Amino acid sequence: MTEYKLVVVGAGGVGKSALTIQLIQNHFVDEYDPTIEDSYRKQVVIDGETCLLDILDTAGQEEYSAMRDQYMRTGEGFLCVFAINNTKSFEDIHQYREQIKRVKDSDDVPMVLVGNKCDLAARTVESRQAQDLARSYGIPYIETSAKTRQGVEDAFYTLVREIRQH
Ligand SMILES: Nc1nc2c(ncn2[C@@H]2O[C@H](COP(=O)(O)OP(=O)(O)NP(=O)(O)O)[C@@H](O)[C@H]2O)c(=O)[nH]1
Ligand SMILES: [Ca+2]
Ligand SMILES: [Ca+2]
Ligand SMILES: [Mg+2]
Ligand SMILES: [Mg+2]
């Protein structure tokens, strides 16, 4: 069956782990344990196709930036996550995209831009700003909440559907 290698990237604390765990395990992780690098796999049906999701949950703490080249080489599609209440995290997206672009020697890498924590009211990144950023990369923008499950399946499934367009 078809296997899709997804890699979840973004700054510390934006909710990469919570998003992934909500998707695979269907619960919300409230506590904050910084990730080094974890792998998750789950067989799922997407648009009638039975497939395997191979998801790499990566480190947002910059001390581990050295590991980025390895996973960027392996991954087929990248979920670029920021938090809507964390401007700096949104600004950090460009540094992730650039490295992906270098490593893949491509600017048609399957990606989805994700604005997570859309359940919180402390918004400093407005939807339209993120929409504009994603437009410049030629990718979708999707808002999520790992807490309420809003948009979680759509984000990852859209990433799959982007890999398929390539
Ligand atoms: N309200 C709310 N809190 C969230 C959401 N996603 C994550 N959080 C909270 O934000 C904190 C950090 O989440 P986490 O998933 O660990 O972030 P991370 O990006 O995986 N961190 P790291 O890069 O260090 O591995 C946790 O306390 C988590 O509960 C969300 O959608 N809504
Ligand atoms: Ca919990
Ligand atoms: Ca692109
Ligand atoms: Mg994490
Ligand atoms: Mg503003």
UniProtKB/Swiss-Prot annotation:
Chain positions found as N-acetylmethionine: 1
Tissues where the protein occurs: Widely expressed.
Post-translational modification: Palmitoylated by the ZDHHC9-GOLGA7 complex. A continuous cycle of de- and re-palmitoylation regulates rapid exchange between plasma membrane and Golgi. S-nitrosylated; critical for redox regulation. Important for stimulating guanine nucleotide exchange. No structural perturbation on nitrosylation.
Residues with S-nitrosocysteine modification: 118
N-acetylthreonine: modified positions: 2
Effect of residue 17 to N: Dominant negative. Prevents PLCE1 EGF-induced recruitment to plasma membrane. No effect on subcellular location of isoform 2
Record entry for activity regulation: Alternates between an inactive form bound to GDP and an active form bound to GTP. Activated by a guanine nucleotide-exchange factor (GEF) and inactivated by a GTPase-activating protein (GAP).
Gene Ontology terms: cellular component: ciliary basal body; cytoplasm; cytosol; endoplasmic reticulum membrane; glutamatergic synapse; Golgi apparatus; Golgi membrane; GTPase complex
Effect of residue 83 to T: GTP-binding activity reduced by factor of 30
Binding-site residues for GTP, renumbered to this chain: 13-18, 29-35, 59-60, 116-119, 145-147
Keywords recorded for this protein, A-Z: Acetylation, Cell membrane, Cytoplasm, Disease variant, Glycoprotein, Golgi apparatus, GTP-binding, Hydrolase, Isopeptide bond, Lipoprotein, Membrane, Methylation, Nucleotide-binding, Nucleus, Palmitate, Prenylation, Proto-oncogene, S-nitrosylation, Ubl conjugation
Entry EC no(s): 3.6.5.2
Swiss-Prot/TrEMBL catalytic activity: GTP + H2O = GDP + phosphate + H(+)
GO-annotated biological processes: adipose tissue development; animal organ morphogenesis; cell surface receptor signaling pathway; cellular response to gamma radiation; cellular senescence; chemotaxis; defense response to protozoan; endocytosis
Keyword Metal-binding: no
Result for mutant: residue 61 to V: Strongly increased transformation of cultured cell lines
A single MF term (Gene Ontology): GDP binding
Family: Belongs to the small GTPase superfamily. Ras family.
Function: Involved in the activation of Ras protein signal transduction. Ras proteins bind GDP/GTP and possess intrinsic GTPase activity.
Implicated disorder: Costello syndrome: A rare condition characterized by prenatally increased growth, postnatal growth deficiency, intellectual disability, distinctive facial appearance, cardiovascular abnormalities (typically pulmonic stenosis, hypertrophic cardiomyopathy and/or atrial tachycardia), tumor predisposition, skin and musculoskeletal abnormalities.
PANTHER family: RAS, DI-RAS, AND RHEB FAMILY MEMBERS OF SMALL GTPASE SUPERFAMILY
Binding partners and assembly: In its GTP-bound form interacts with PLCE1. Interacts with TBC1D10C. Interacts with RGL3. Interacts with HSPD1. Found in a complex with at least BRAF, HRAS, MAP2K1, MAPK3 and RGS14. Interacts (active GTP-bound form) with RGS14 (via RBD 1 domain). Forms a signaling complex with RASGRP1 and DGKZ. Interacts with RASSF5. Interacts with PDE6D. Interacts with IKZF3. Interacts with RACK1. Interacts with PIK3CG; the interaction is required for membrane recruitment and beta-gamma G protein dimer-dependent activation of the PI3K gamma complex PIK3CG:PIK3R6. Interacts with RAPGEF2.
Name of the protein this chain belongs to: GTPase HRas
